[model samples]
Target chain A: FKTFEWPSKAAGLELQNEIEQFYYREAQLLDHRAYEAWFALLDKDIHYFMPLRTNRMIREGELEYSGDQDLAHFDETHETMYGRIRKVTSDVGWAENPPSRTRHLVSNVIVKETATPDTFEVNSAFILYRNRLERQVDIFAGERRDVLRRADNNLGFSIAKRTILLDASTLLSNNLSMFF
Target chain B: NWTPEAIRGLVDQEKGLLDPRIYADQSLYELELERVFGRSWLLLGHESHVPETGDFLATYMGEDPVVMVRQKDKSIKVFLNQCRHRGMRICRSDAGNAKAFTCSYHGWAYDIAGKLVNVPFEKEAFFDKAEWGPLQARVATYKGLVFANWDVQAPDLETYLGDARPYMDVMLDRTPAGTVAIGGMQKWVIPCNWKFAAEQFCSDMYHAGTTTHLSGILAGIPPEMDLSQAQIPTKGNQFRAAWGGHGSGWYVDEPGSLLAVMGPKVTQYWTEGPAAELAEQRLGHTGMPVRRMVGQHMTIFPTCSFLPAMNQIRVWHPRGPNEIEVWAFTLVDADAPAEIKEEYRRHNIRNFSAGGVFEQDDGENWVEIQKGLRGYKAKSQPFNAQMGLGRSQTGHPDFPGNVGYVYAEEAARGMYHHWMRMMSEPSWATLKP
Candidate 1:
């Protein structure tokens, strides 16, 4: 057994702090409906996917997530996402016509080493609480494991990939118009 | 006086099918609940779901809330979910594991076997605990599928399954281990009569060629490759068979006729790689003459229906005259490879759920059928089930009794005949063969 020692000053501590702040800021932008800024944070090669959830028997081994092949509540590329935002902003996304008030609670951050010196892998748990007009307040809470790359300026980070793991096996509500 | 003859005449003149009102009328619905649902061997959950001791699930067999749990001996047991005292619901959640269920109102507790374990203030409140304890219902399993009947005198599940057993055996036997696992359940409320949904499984093949014209286009198959075309004598022969109360039948189209219409993309998606092999192997030995063919079998008399091609088993539980709770679950062989099972689960949800393509079409028709009957003029007007009435025949090599040979309204006729029989014959003595 080896004695534990705390680092006097952590390597890439500043970069890790910057990446964490960027995540919080991005989440804030989404919660505030700042679609433009939120879209800007995504990398060109970003893959935004949300697969359906399903129940698992306790004895069926450790299941990280449910990816049953069926109707994806939201399976979109960047182009499709842009089109959806355009439609919703244009007053055509009927499910979101009235608009939904949303708040994203993202915390429990952990940063891991990456191949590139400037890039880092970040994992954070998120709970998105949302409410539409006259409907029950809904929840989409899950852990978001993301890979972030620091830009040349070292001021902000771009999302390389985001995999969202939802908790509920079946969604009680319909339509995932609210951003998380 | 409204005699049985009068009822029979009224039924025959109405063209072998009764109005939807017959399903909703309080008197009629009550009669059905007591006669059909009460006496019939209704399916409960499977045994694999509650494999361990104290594991349990709560579900409904018609109106009765049933609790299916695994006992200490590892045997599956099912009993009424209601407490004998004051009829309070004992188990509430859809499913869970519990050692004992205690009544909230009276604080009466029952063990996993449904034996009365303890009763609060028993000596002060009442007599001996054993004398006042809850009673257990008869439970049976067929191929790991559990079933229960309220009428103790009703035939055993095997006897009730009758001709339907072979088809069920085919479904269960597909799995190499000869067992099935419940891959979770999905429930949706449809504004339609239960009978309408029940009959759709077995005899509504005609609607596919006519009603679901857009299905072929969306599925990337030609719209002209419909059932009507497939049913034409030159195209494919149509065969129907009734197995006592439940049955199986098929419409076999010309070989490779659909391949041309399905397009290369759709055909490739359906028939390539492991999925194709899995599908072929699962349905390989159906005892049918042809090697590879797509067909439909429906169960009209019972409240549940299975679509093998679609990999869906739907339970139409009547909630009210105009409302039915449709519980659907995807069926896959237990021995299927992980990737194949995943694919089937995906395909099942996409085609059967509330937002599924086929279900959307079915919902619209069911709602319209119910709405149309609400009108005073339509309620009194006779409905027709006269399609291919004279074409029904008997004595086939594979089928039992007088089976309807066409994809017409014969199953509907048979269903109504059974329905009328159940409604008219109030005593179990009359039901015994």
Candidate 2:
């Protein structure tokens, strides 16, 4: 159900700067542990998903990632995201109570205009480094496909959808407690 | 470095004292790779994963990589993924329907059953095709869950499972249609001894009552439900299998906890409605109170564990003395309505999967404990596993095996006690029931 038309043209350097700026602010929100502020940047109809990735033969590489109905690291709606946000922000959420120190390194921004009005299909690579407690550290590198909708909000855009394609077949981290 | 006598000294079943070194010792870990993991019936995904002929899943049995493939005969075969030549993985792909696997290292070819049919330059280099096939495991399935063991002398799957089957039926055989594995397997790593995860599922439902899961429960409960009134049920039973190390713990007559964790749609599907009716008719035939049971957590011996209503099945594959890779998935009744199946997918993701709110807490504790064991004094200390030591009964009207308080360590003791036997006794003639 989630499909995007081929990009007809680039958003140009000026719009490109604006879109890249939006991504940096988004990353900053997550890195600063601003769950509520991060939530505000998401559209009401946000479809946040991280499909399960399996190792497959070279010929069958297209089927490596799981489908919509298949199991995923995350397949969340706005309400569910709110629930998770609530849990992480709570004092008893032991995994995040002593919050992880994180740095979201977002780069390689490619913004293209999709067929839909106000919607841009944005692709970016990310390296989310998290260190918690004593020496427990996890570095996750992945690519994110986002449907960014031009908004009147202070951030200048809202994330309507995001599909995270994690690099590892088996996660090296203990849990996906932090956002990408 | 470990004798049978020295290995037996690690766990005191009577006093419930556990030496911390079992989670950190390199030599002990080496022995466990053979005695415990090698000999036990370890879970290797579900039957649905390899449903068709030639379909295969590349997974692990303990730390050793193996391929579980559906043979042409429709029976499942499990063989080491390693090639006879250069010891490369014969099947490199995670999963697919394959006619045969050709090792990328050399052109060594093998069939679905892991039989070596063709080897490159066989006539020129001179290698006997018949003489070399990676090791084959004794494979078995119980209610759609596939298990394999390296030891041929070990008891059959049913016999190995023993008195634990009845408790397992609460999750597996609830309906005549059986269970279908949902989605793909979700795997992640946790830095802890495998026993930390296994022992807790077998015996430690007590963690749920504590603040460890309070935040998850608070966030999970429906908005309409009052936060002040939310309380975990204290009434439940713990089961320690008589012979095998298998164990299960579940709360009785409590559907609220299920509702909180799984939400209303799944909670209703499990506790009431048409699916629940069919489950009661089938599960009640054997005298199990299906509707009244909730929050069931079970471990089948060394590694396999699952939550009954939650439907989160997993195998704790030990990495080293300090780590384990958890390969987990969800299951639902095969005949379940599409919406109900979707609910299981959603709720399972919310509460038990890698990103699941409740699951995060459990891993945090285990990871921290493993980090602590790195200290000299910490690894040398003895941990208490004596929650319900002397208080265990047998022949319950509704339950089988040794029954204990819901919050108890009798099952944990039974697990370690059996583990000690598996570690010490080498002969099945002396060990087998």
Candidate 3:
């Protein structure tokens, strides 16, 4: 399904600005722990997924990690991802009881005009650093393939879909309770 | 200083006490390799995991790496992953579809069924291909899960599972289509004994409302769920297998508590509807009034454990007495509507993955306990396993095996009791179901 080769030849100045501003704001809301605001920026039917990264022989004929739904680390819809925010915001979210400090670094974003107007396929590279309770720190580096749509003129933009491809196969961390 | 009896002596079932040595001693860990792990029907993966001919995944049975492969005739086989010649891994990748496995070093190839098919120089190498292939194991399937055992004398998977089947059927037999593994196994290391992970799955539902999941549950509640009014299920029953040393329990008859974690869409499909109707009908054999059982936590001896409503299956692979590798996956009904399948896959991670609230509670607890066991005095200290000590009873009207209160440690006792029996007695003849 990843037929369009990744990083579809940079884009116009105006489109690049729109993508950059949209994602930067996303990282900010998440970092500020403004989950309710972050949650609203998504379409009700958003497809948020993160495939399990694997070590593979990137041979001539095979796909790297297959990009197949064979296995994934995160596969959720808008409601489920929303549930995550609800969990941590609740009175006893133990995973984040002390609340892990996070910084989402979004870079190398590429946008392309798609067959459908107002909707474009977007890709970007990201590095996420999370520090939990003193020295328990984790860095998740991955590239995201997202379906971006200009949902409402006033709302600016919304994420119609997201697929995060992480770099590590066997996660060194005990749990991936945090968002990618 | 360490013998099977000594290791077994650590667990005192009558008083619900356990010597802390069971958590840190090296010798007992070695004996566990021969006894608990070597004999149990360890979960290999799902049958759907290798649905096609020549599809395969590299997995482990205890410390030994094994390749689970699908053959031309549609049968699955598990062969020890070591090369017959020098013991290097035959296939290094986690999973793939391959016609045959060729040793990365020295080029030895084996067929899909693990039969040694080719050698560098058959005539010049002077090795019998028949005897040169890796050792094969006994593979069995229940519902859709594939399991393998090294002991030829070990009971078949069903017999080995025994009463664990009814609990399994809650998840497996719920639908006509059965369940299939989705996403992939999310594995990570836990610096704790494998027992901590397995026992929690078997009978540790008590940690949910108090310190572990309250925050996640509070935060994860969807729009329809009201955290203020909702009360987690406190009343339930725990079941310890009379024979196989398996254990399971759930909050009784309360579907509302599940909604706090499962969200609205998943709760509807799981608790009420045509699918739920079929599930209750299919799982009615277990006798616990299937609809109200909430989600169950259970372990099928040693390491295999699952949550029925949550649809998550995890195998605690023991690395040593002090460490383990947690390989977990999400399961969903094959016949479930695509959305239902997606619902399960999506919500599962929201509640249980590495960053999952409940998962954090568990890992944190296990890690802390392991850290504490490092102390000299900690080893001298004993753990209390005595929840519902005298309360266990046999003969539930519909349920088979020993039954106890939902909130109890009898299941933990059951697991350790069985572990001791297996460690002390290598033969399955006396322990066979």
Candidate 4:
């Protein structure tokens, strides 16, 4: 049996814990409408996307869902994400005016070694539930496969890339307001 | 009660079209609900939508909610989306994989095949569990599309499809695999009679010269100069109106050329090497040989309208006389590349939705047309379906129906003729020519 152990260096352990903490904090910031802090967590090269899901026969293999090919609820770069956040905050995104109440539950965190010593690959599962007035509660539960890179000593970690694999092929509810 | 003689007289006086009141009048609508929607073979979802065992979806045919599910035995089944107890909706979610449906209202439960699995408090309370359960509807699939009918008297799906079957075959046969998966669905509500939207399918080529001129212009296709001149046959274009009130109008040119002249930006988007490659692969190198085919519209009889170039299938479902819910699904060639599918979806969104450029124009006109009919003065005045009365010819070797070489007013005239036939002849036994 393989045994798991924490990194020996106090700084490395602290950094790893901070990275995990940052993810939870970021989820809260998005749910609570704290746009500024949420914007700070992404790297300059962040690629944020949510591809459409389809119900394919299980025999069709692992790639049943049409990946990166069809219409998506959200497909954006860091700049585009920032623009979307700004638009909603400015009251111009009428779709979100009365604002949805969101709850993001992220768990089952695992970090793996990456090419660069300071960088790591993380895998987590997330369930984001949202409700708008007079509308049924909408949910998006998915697994997140992410690339995280450590910044210079004091700067902390930045998200290099994120690929979200949603379980449902067709959405039961409406638009996606928060990140999952 | 409306007599056949009185209905015929009213129809003839109104040029084979009935008054708007027929669409939503409670008695008439109910009669239609029983006769038309009840007997017609309505489309449920496609078989490919529920590919796996245990997968299922809930959909509607008129007001009857249906559950289309795949059983553990690998066969497909459809049932009413109602619980045997108190008629509560059994499946509340849009879709999911489940072994059984347990009604929240009562504790009655049914299995994937809609067989009674469990009835809570059955043994301790009153009746035998075997006596209570849900029942399955008559389910059938034709070329991967599922359909259900409440009336057992209705013909099988293939026989009911009739003349429209060939066109559907052409669409499905485009894929060598002999199937097409739904990319996704887009739905919106429109405030108008369902018939108005259905009429837009077979006829309404008049809009090409009048309202939708911008679409042609934007796509770089030449605009029709004169409505009166449209009826004259030209070798370059083909105008075909099918029997059973379904048809298409197409203009074909040589291959590898712009069928319609469009803006430079739009042209670049559609004709860039990648998009052209995708189109060629899916449509076949020589298929769809039109520089710009402006109006190739088809009505699947009562409700569905398909536009091939626009890549959209629209359903105008009647809510009331003045209300309709339009459901649109974007179509792409089964073999299309990822980028091509994305572009097709984007184009469909820009031009065909409730807020789309083309929809805004059409909605205004349809709304006005419905409002005008409400006036007593307007109702007294006769509507025109006499644009090319004597010009429509029969026995064209290549085309079907009362064939016309030109895009005359044949389609609108044909629709009203069919509508009168449907309304006056309430029983299918009396439909013999």
Best by lDDT: 2
What are the TM-scores, per candidate, against the unseen true structure?
0.68, 0.96, 0.89, 0.63
Q: Is candidate 1 or candidate 4 better by TM-score?
A: 1
lDDT of 4 at B123: 75
Kindly report which residue stretches of model 1 are placed more than 4 angstroms away from their true locations once superposed: A1-180, B1-10, B131-135, B220-244, B253-287, B290-293, B398-401
DockQ of candidate 1 (2 decimals)? 0.07
Q: lDDT by residue for model 2 over B1-433, one digit each (tens)?
A: 7798988999899888999898888898898988888889999989889888999898998779999999878899999988877899788889988987888887888887688898767788654667689999999999899999998788999988988888788888877777999858899999889998998888888898677888788767765554578766889989998888788899998876787888878778777887778778876656777788877999998999999888889999999989999999988888888988888888788777788888899989988888888899896778898898888888678876688899998899899889899889988998986
Ranking by DockQ, best first? 2, 3, 1, 4
Worst lDDT run of 10 residues, candidate 3 chain B, spans B218-227
Model 1, first chain, TM-score of: 0.81
Shift in Å, residue A58, candidate 4: 21
Task: List chain B TM-scores, each candidate.
Answer: 0.84, 0.97, 0.96, 0.79
The TM-score measured for candidate 3 stands at 0.89
Model 1 residue B179 CA deviation (Å) reads 3.6
Native contacts kept (model 4): 0.03
| Model 3 DockQ vs. reference | 0.46
User: Which CAPRI quality tier does the interface of model 2 achieve?
Assistant: medium
lDDT of 4 by residue, B1-433 (tens): 6666655554452343445555434555555666666666666667666778877776666667778899777678888887777889887755557766788896777878787878777777755555465656678786566667776765666666555554454344444454455554445455567777777766665565343433322322223332233232233222333435555554333211122322223334334455444444665433443323333566766676777555566766666676666656655555656655565565454445443434544654565566666676666655655555566565544444455533455666666566666667777666432
Q: Clash pairs of candidate 2?
A: none
The iRMS of model 2 comes to: 1.0
lDDT of each residue in A3-73, candidate 4, tens digit only: 22323433356655776786787687878988766677788888765555544434434434444544444
Q: Is the docking of candidate 4 incorrect, acceptable, medium or high quality?
A: incorrect
TM-scores of chain A across the candidates, in order, are 0.81, 0.93, 0.88, 0.81
